[PDB]
């Protein structure tokens, strides 16, 4: 660990459905957030285990049904662990359990209300520029188009432990700066968006043997961070923000802009916002 | 100590969720066993004390203030809930099976040339829908009705929603008008029907279950499970199957699509997933190569 002596302060969030926990702890006594998530199963190793001597412990039995506790060997026990240190107050609110509300943001709303709210915020995306500038994660890059205007870096997302294809998850981060979200897209960006889609899919084919009809390829709105990026996920993975209230398919985004240059300037977008988000109030009053 | 069979040989992964950390395995033994494995929730006290005391971490990568690891915790954190069905009837295998899907981008032309003729090659009875609409069956289940034959609908709960909690709220709106198979048939003629579903459907859920519209995901499926126009009202906190961008279409945006673009659902390419063994997939692929 990059610190010593974690002291619990608050379980920020806890999900039995996702088997994931978000903890705020004090260290070096400085705030840190530790995220722990049980990992996906490896089917061949589990099968191999079931045909041997697995450590089982019968909970109950009812004729054809029986429920056990299983304690696999060390290799099958991997827990996905993410540390954010030093953590800011942003991070402590961000990962907290809150209730979401749906909101329909018109094209006027965006430029008059949402954009000025975003522009009033001082956001950190140094991790994004570290990837682009080859300061971090240089040799994790699966593909890069180095053109400053229409180029991008395709790289595994932090969520993905990379140990199985079932939850395959890569992000494409564009080299061009100042494109914050889906709202900023015009026909100017068609060649970049097309590069991401078609070059992103070929790289994933060549690297992972995953065909394009196996990929759900989308952007988030609202995004979690404001530097345009596209998510490449296995269709069988119920991936983060893949619901219709957040995910916008790249193929569709390209075609929307081809039919109507002002699409993402003019059209109402629908998305979820946290109850304690000041943006939610500002949109509700306008 | 031991399982009730020998030689567990994997036949098929019936189901897997990477998000839920669950796998349903079909194995031959010795003769059909289903082993269902689910990783368990975290116990906070065990994590908290592990993290103060000599944890076995291994770095995946770091960047700035972020770092990810592989943690191999001690025994108490490693419990995997393991359910065995043995023997497994075909009914078991079929209820745990979801075939893997493939994406297809159907053009307006593909729908006319390929998908619609395939649909008309099949006979699928929707009589159960008409029996609800005509009040011969499930009249006691209807929560709201606009009885108008052109612009009206029926609001009925999902059959898996017991109405014991608002968390998994799920109702369905079925229109009185017949002949609207799917999204592909929608025109500005149906806008009064569609605004009634959205606005009256939301108002009736507010009044009955005390849930506001900004708590509701209101959407159509394409492809639909049955070809008589219907809409899903779910709680936002309920990420129910079918609400993925690749199947779901928000009713609000469908209304507005047709408001500024009359022939959208006849002209535009729609994206959906088909089961790998679905003969409609084959046709569409062959017609696109
Ligand atoms: N390749 C790669 N990919 C990433 N996504 C990286 C990274 O991401 C930071 C976080 C920022 C927040 N989220 C999503 C999120 C999850 C829970 C709660 C709120 C959220 F916004 C996305 C991941 C941070 C640092 C390095 C990263 N490297």
* Distance (Å, whole) CA A220 – CA B206: 29
Q: How far apart are CA A215 and CA A237, in angstroms?
A: 9
- φ, ψ (nearest 5 deg) of residue B171: -120, 165
Distance CA A47, CA B237 (A): 34
Which residues is chain A interrupted after (C–N above 2.5 Å)?
A: 29
Q: Is A65 annotated as a binding residue?
A: no
First-to-final CA distance of chain A: 47
The first and second tokens of residue A118, run together, are 């975003």
* Helix, strand or coil, per DSSP, at residue B177: coil
User: Considering only CA atoms, which of B283, B285, B1, B289 is closest in space to residue B114?
Assistant: B283
If you ran DSSP here, which 8-state letter would residue B244 be given?
A: B
Length of chain B: 289
Start-to-end C-alpha separation, chain B: 54
B64·A268 Cβ contact <8 A = no
* B15's tokens: 């189901």
For A99-286, the fitting CATH number among 3.90.1150.10, 3.60.20.10, 3.30.428.10, 3.30.9.10 is: 3.30.428.10
Structure tokens at B241: 């199957």
Beta pairing partners, B273: B103
Contacts of A13 (CB under 8 A, 6+ apart): A20, A21, A22, A95, A96, A97
Using the Cα atoms of residue A230, residue A232, residue A236 and residue A238 in order, give the sign of their dihedral. negative
Strand locations in A16-86, DSSP E? 20-26, 31-38, 55-62, 65-71, 79-84
CB A137 within 8 A of CB A191: no
Q: Smallest CA–CA separation between B140 and chain A, in Å?
A: 31
Neighbours of A215 (CB within 10 A): 24
User: Crossing angle, helix B251-260 and helix B191-209, to 10 degrees?
Assistant: 160
Helix boundaries (H) for chain A: 43-50, 89-94, 107-109, 115-119, 126-132, 190-208, 250-259, 263-266, 278-284
Structure token pair of residue A274: 């946290």
Alpha-carbon distance of B14 to A252, in angstroms, equals: 31
User: From the list A81, A101, A252, which residue is nearest B271 (CB)?
Assistant: A252
| The domain made up of A1-98 is a member of CATH 3.10.290.10 | no
Helix (H) or strand (E) holding B39: strand B32-39
Q: Could you give the angle at the alpha carbon of A275 between the alpha carbons of A270 and A281, nearest 5°?
A: 70
Locus of tokens 């108490």: B76
- A257 and A185 Cβ atoms separated by less than 8 Å: yes
Among residues B215, B230, B249, B264, which one is catalytic?
Answer: B230
The answer to whether B267 and B93 have CB atoms below 8 angstroms apart is no
CA distance A286 to A239: 32
Q: Considering only CA atoms, which of B257, B240, B138 is closest in space to residue B191?
A: B257
Q: Is there a contact between B164 and B148 (Cβ–Cβ < 8 Å)?
A: no
Phi and psi angles of residue A144, each rounded to the nearest 5 degrees, phi first: -140, 135
Q: Are B280 and B273 in contact (CB under 8 A)?
A: no
Name residues whose C-beta falls within 8 Å of residue A89's C-beta, 6 or more positions apart in sequence: none
Q: List phi, psi (to 5°) of A184.
A: -80, 0
Q: How many CB pairs under 8 A join A and B?
A: 266
Residue A249, class by beta-carbon neighbours within 10 Å (0-12 exposed, 13-18 middle, 19+ buried)?
A: buried
Rg (CA), chain A: 22
For the record, the structure tokens of B120 come out as: 């008309």
Q: In the block, which residue shows the tokens 């609800």?
A: B132
Q: How many CA atoms lie within 13 A of A24 on its CB side?
A: 18
Q: State the resolution, in angstroms.
A: 2.3
Whether residues B215 and A81 touch (CB distance < 8 A) is answered with no
Pairing of strands A169-174, A152-156: antiparallel
Which residue's alpha carbon is nearest to atom 16 within ligand 1?
A95
Phi, psi at residue A123, to the nearest 5°? -100, 145
CATH homologous superfamily of B96-125+245-289:
mRNA decapping enzyme DcpS N-terminal domain (3.30.2240.10)
**Cβ pair B73:A65 closer than 8 A:** no
Q: How far is CA A82 from the centre of its chain?
A: 13
Q: What does the alpha-carbon distance between residue B77 and residue B51 come to, in Å, rounded to a whole number? A: 12
Out of A14, A18, A24, A127, give the residue to mutate to test ligand 1, the one with the largest number of ligand atoms within 8 Å of its CB.
Answer: A127
CA gap B169, B166 in Å, rounded: 5
Query: How far apart are the C-alpha atoms of A73 and B79, rounded to whole Å?
Result: 11
Topology of the domain covering B126-244 = HIT family, subunit A (3.30.428)
In this structure, which residue's CA is closest to atom 1 in ligand 1?
A: A157
Paired strand residues for B173: B155, B231
Distance CA A183, CA A189 (A): 12
CB A106 within 8 A of CB A284: no
Gaps in chain B (C to N over 2.5 angstroms) fall after 30
Cα B261 to Cα B248: distance, rounded to the nearest angstrom: 20
Tell whether A154 is in a known binding site.
Answer: no
The owner of tokens 């956001």 is: A123
Q: How many CB atoms lie under 10 A from the CB of residue B89? A: 12
Helix (H/G/I), strand (E/B), else coil: B158: coil
Residue B185 φ/ψ, nearest 5 degrees: -100, -5
Residues in chain A: 286
- CA distance linking residue B186 with residue B255, whole number of Å: 10
Residue A16, both tokens: 């039995």
- DSSP letters for A163-210: S-GGG-EEEEEESSS---SGGG--GGGHHHHHHHHHHHHHHHHHHH--
Give the 3-state secondary structure of residue A114: helix
Give me the residue from A47, A78, A137 closest to B61, CB to CB.
Answer: A137
Taking alpha carbons only, the member of B225, B58, B180, B281 closest to residue A77 is: B58
Q: Tell me the CA–centroid distance for residue A264 and ligand 1, in Å.
A: 25
d(CA A214, CA A208) in angstroms, rounded, equals: 11
Question: What span, in angstroms and rounded, lies between the C-alpha atoms of A236 and A229?
Answer: 21
CB contact under 8 A, B214 and A101: yes
The dihedral region occupied by B201, where left means phi > 0, alpha psi between -120 and 50, and beta the remainder, is alpha
The rounded distance, in Å, linking the Cα atoms of A253 and A199 is 16
Option in A40, A81, A242 nearest B69 (CB): A81
Taking the CA atoms of B278, B280, B284 and B286 in sequence, report the sign of the dihedral they define: positive
* Domain locations in chain A as residue ranges: 1-98, 99-286
DSSP state of A99: -
What distance in Å separates the CA atoms of residue B181 and residue B187, rounded to the nearest whole number? 12
Tell me the C-alpha distance between A24 and A33, whole Å.
5
Q: How far apart are CA B125 and CA B139, in angstroms?
A: 20
Q: Residue B100 phi/psi, 5° resolution?
A: -75, 150
Pocket of ligand 1 contains residue A217 by CB under 6 Å: no
Catalytic residue numbers of A, as ranges: 229
CB of B61 closer than 6 A to ligand 1? no
Burial (Cβ within 10 Å: 0-12, 13-18, ≥19) of residue A38? buried
Q: Tell whether residue B221 is among the known ligand binding residues.
A: yes
Going by C-alpha positions, the residue among A223, A219, A198, A217 that lies closest to residue A143 is: A198
Rounded to whole angstroms, the Cα distance separating B55 from B39 reads 20
Please give the DSSP secondary-structure letter assigned to residue B42.
P
CA distances from B236 to A248, A283, A285, B157 (A): 17, 19, 22, 16
Strand order in the sheet with A20-26: A7-15, A20-26, A31-38, A79-84, B66-71, B57-63
Give the CATH number of domain B1-95.
Answer: 3.30.200.40
Compute how many other C-beta atoms are within 10 angstroms of the C-beta atom of residue A70.
22
CA angle A228, A229, A230 (to 5 degrees): 135
Which runs of E-coded beta strand occur in B101-260?
Answer: 101-106, 144-146, 153-157, 170-175, 216-221, 230-235, 248-250
Cβ–Cβ below 8 Å for A251 and B105: yes
How far is it, in rounded angstroms, from Cα A94 to Cα A117?
A: 17
Technique behind the model: X-ray
Q: Are A191 and A198 a contacting pair, CB within 8 Å?
A: no
CA distance B135 to chain A (A): 33
Helix (H) or strand (E) holding A82: strand A79-84
**Distance from C-alpha of A272 to C-alpha of A225, rounded to nearest angstrom:** 15
Pairing of strands A65-71, A79-84: unpaired
Give burial (CB, 10 Å; 0-12/13-18/19+) of A53: exposed
Q: How far is CA B198 from CA A102, A286, B194, B204, B231, in A?
A: 14, 21, 6, 10, 9
Backbone angles phi, psi at A11, to 5 degrees: -70, 105
Evaluate whether B177 touches B193 at the Cβ level (below 8 Å): yes
Cβ–Cβ under 8 Å, residues A219 and A231: yes
């Amino acid at each position: 660990l990059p610190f010593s002596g974690f002291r619990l302060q608050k379980v920020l969030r806890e999900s039995a459905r996702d088997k994931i926990i978000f903890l705020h702890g004090k260290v070096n006594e400085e705030d840190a957030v530790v995220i722990l998530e049980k990992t996906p199963f490896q089917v061949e190793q589990v099968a191999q285990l079931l045909t041997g001597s697995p450590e089982l412990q019968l909970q109950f039995s009812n004729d054809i049904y029986s429920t056990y506790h299983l304690f696999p060997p060390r290799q099958l026990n991997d827990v996905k662990t993410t540390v954010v240190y030093p953590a800011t107050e942003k991070h402590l609110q961000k990962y907290l359990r809150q209730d979401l509300r749906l909101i329909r943001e018109t094209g006027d709303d965006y430029r008059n209300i949402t954009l000025p709210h975003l522009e009033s915020q001082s956001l950190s995306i140094q991790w994004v520029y570290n990837i682009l500038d080859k300061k971090a994660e240089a040799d994790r890059i699966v593909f890069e188009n180095p053109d400053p205007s229409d180029g991008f870096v395709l790289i595994p997302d932090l969520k993905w432990n990379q140990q199985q294809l079932d939850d395959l998850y890569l992000i494409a981060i564009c080299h061009r700066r100042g494109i914050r979200s889906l709202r900023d897209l015009t026909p100017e960006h068609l060649p970049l968006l097309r590069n991401i889609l078609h070059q992103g899919q070929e790289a994933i084919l060549q690297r992972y043997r995953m065909k394009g009809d196996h990929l759900r390829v989308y952007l988030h709105y609202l995004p979690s961070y404001y530097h345009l990026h596209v998510h490449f996920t296995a269709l069988g993975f119920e991936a983060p923000g893949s619901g219709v209230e957040r995910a916008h398919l790249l193929a569709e985004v390209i075609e929307n802009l081809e039919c109507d240059p002002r699409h993402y300037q003019q059209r109402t977008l629908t998305f979820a916002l946290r109850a304690d988000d000041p943006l939610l109030k500002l949109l509700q009053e306008a």
